[PDB]
Design a protein around this ligand. Structure first.
Ligand SMILES: Nc1nc2c(ncn2[C@@H]2O[C@H](COP(=O)(O)OP(=O)(O)O)[C@@H](O)[C@H]2O)c(=O)[nH]1
Ligand SMILES: *[C@@H]1[C@@H](C(=O)OCC=C)c2ccccc2S1(=O)=O
Length: 171
């Protein structure tokens, strides 16, 4: 139960790299945190077990070895990114990583009540994603869990990688 492979997917600019950075910076002893994550190994202890979590980021390859857990990310400031969860990312991962557990991640939750974000979205007849919309989507796609994060304030980040690790440990 030591080596587990995590892949993070979702629309461009939802914060996938930022989430990996925050998680990797949280490691102690401190290590150099890169800008690219491809089989990057981070150590984590969850519950009892020490785990080597190999991180794979798909930033730059959104428009195009067996994985243990998927972080599937949308952004709270982008209802478009949430709609791509059922229409694009879930079909893709279920074709290529069937039976791999999915954690649905709503990132940028620090923008839910941000006035600038709300007015830009208003010009599109859109509003920030509501928490229950995230939970419904997670239910609809059969996700192992749903979490809201902010890579900016770091809230939720540690918890989502803990949840991802438990899912990888249970298969
Ligand atoms: N306000 C806010 N901005 C974020 C958050 N995560 C990422 N960002 C910003 O979103 C932009 C894209 O982030 P990035 O990690 O590169 O997204 P990626 O394309 O999915 O890998 C950056 O300029 C961030 O700094 C967040 O939780 N809150
Ligand atoms: C499954 C996973 C995969 O196929 O393993 C290969 C790792 C490079 C993967 C990889 C990249 C993007 C998506 C996915 S997946 O969740 O469909």
């Amino acid at each position: 139960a030591i080596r587990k492979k995590l892949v993070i997917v979702g629309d461009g600019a939802v914060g996938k790299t930022s989430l990996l950075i925050v998680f990797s910076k949280d490691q102690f002893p401190e290590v150099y945190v890169p800008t690219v994550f491809e089989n990057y190994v981070a150590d984590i202890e969850v519950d009892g077990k020490q785990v080597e979590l190999a991180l794979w980021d798909t930033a730059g390859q959104e428009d195009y070895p067996d994985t243990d857990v998927i972080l599937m990310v949308f952004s709270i400031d982008s209802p478009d990114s949430l709609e791509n969860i059922p229409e694009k990312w879930t079909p893709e991962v279920k074709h290529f990583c069937p039976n791999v557990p999915i954690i649905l991640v709503g990132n940028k939750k620090d923008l839910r009540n941000d006035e600038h974000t709300r007015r830009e979205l208003a010009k599109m007849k859109q509003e920030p994603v509501k928490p229950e919309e995230g939970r419904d989507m997670a239910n609809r796609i059969g996700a192992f869990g749903y979490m809201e994060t902010s890579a900016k304030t770091k809230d939720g980040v540690r918890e989502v990688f803990e949840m991802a690790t438990r899912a990888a440990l249970q298969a």
